[PDB]
């Protein structure tokens, strides 16, 4: 793990589209590092024209930071490539996002795999906080699976690399972020909060049915995501505290890490469930 590697528009190969989003489309590809006769499997994301347009020197900077994230639970930017469009290169993640994944195994996932992912995700965010970096878009759909036992937060820096100039994940945003577009490690803890809920409810859509536009209000009124079925009061409670109105009263990642680590140490005492290696995303990468 080192700094940012700049590629030439002929050092990688787009093999096949895996799926386009709103920030751009992604392909399965190979990396032919000029020099060595080695070819490593990556993932190429070709962003779309940005409204604001940050010159090739600034874009180039944010990319370094994204390239400097060194932690087992936070995808790092391997290589960038500027041409008439920008393309980001990163190590490909076999199983896809942790969201589709938990939905696709709602009866195969045990108390231990959840608690663990919780701890790992905390771990990662705690790192991003140590480096005075705010994610702004944590969410189960942004946690990729390397293996059912190792997950990592992704997309760090991609959002802000285009939409911090003046859509929005309202249901993952903390009150302040919604009302004033305020983002901090404490606002992330809010999101962490939802992310844990998505997991505990095997991929249920949060505030499902309620329009986004209505969220700020119900939120101010004292409304929160419900206690998931499999959650004892102990677990839910922590999910709730990440949704306090006063950011400063929300648990700190280092605290979270410690909590879930403890529970992970007696899973069946905090999560009650009745009682994998696959995902249709994996079927597309084979």
């Amino acid at each position: 793990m080192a700094l940012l590697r700049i590629l030439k528009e002929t050092e990688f190969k787009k093999i096949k589209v895996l799926g386009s989003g709103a920030f751009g489309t992604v392909y399965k590809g190979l990396w032919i590092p000029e020099g060595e006769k080695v070819k490593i499997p990556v993932a190429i994301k070709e962003l779309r024209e940005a409204t604001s347009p940050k010159a090739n020197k600034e874009i180039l900077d944010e990319a370094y930071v994204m390239a400097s994230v060194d932690n087992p639970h936070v995808c790092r930017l391997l290589g960038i490539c500027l041409t008439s469009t920008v393309q980001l290169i990163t190590q490909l993640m076999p199983f896809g996002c942790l969201l589709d994944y938990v939905r696709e195994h709602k009866d195969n996932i045990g108390s231990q795999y959840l608690l663990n992912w919780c701890v790992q995700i905390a771990e990662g965010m705690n790192y991003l906080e140590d480096r005075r970096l705010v994610h702004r878009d944590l969410a189960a759909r942004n946690v990729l699976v390397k293996t059912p036992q190792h997950v990592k937060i992704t997309d760090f820096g991609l959002a802000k690399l285009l939409g911090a100039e003046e859509k929005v994940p309202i249901k993952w945003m903390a009150l302040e972020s919604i009302l004033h577009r305020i983002y901090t490690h404490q606002s992330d803890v809010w999101s962490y909060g939802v992310t844990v809920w998505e997991l505990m409810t095997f991929g249920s859509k949060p505030y499902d049915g309620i329009p986004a536009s209505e969220i700020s209000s119900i939120l101010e009124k004292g409304e929160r995501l419900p206690q998931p079925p499999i959650c004892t009061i102990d677990v839910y409670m922590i999910m709730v505290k990440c949704w306090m109105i006063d950011a400063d009263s929300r648990p700190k990642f280092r605290e979270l890490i410690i909590e879930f680590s403890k529970m992970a140490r007696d899973p069946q005492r905090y999560l009650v469930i009745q009682g994998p290696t696959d995902s249709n995303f994996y079927r597309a990468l084979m």
Binding site: L175, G209, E220, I233, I245
Partner: peptide, 26 residues
């Protein structure tokens, strides 16, 4: 200490008012 949901149907939300921690004052 689980949720006694009437047929697992887990409701859109859960309220915490009046506790002022989750209830903003306008």
């Amino acid at each position: 200490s689980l949720p006694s949901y009437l047929n697992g149907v887990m409701p859109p939300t859960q309220s915490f008012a009046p506790d002022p921690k989750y209830v903003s004052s306008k």
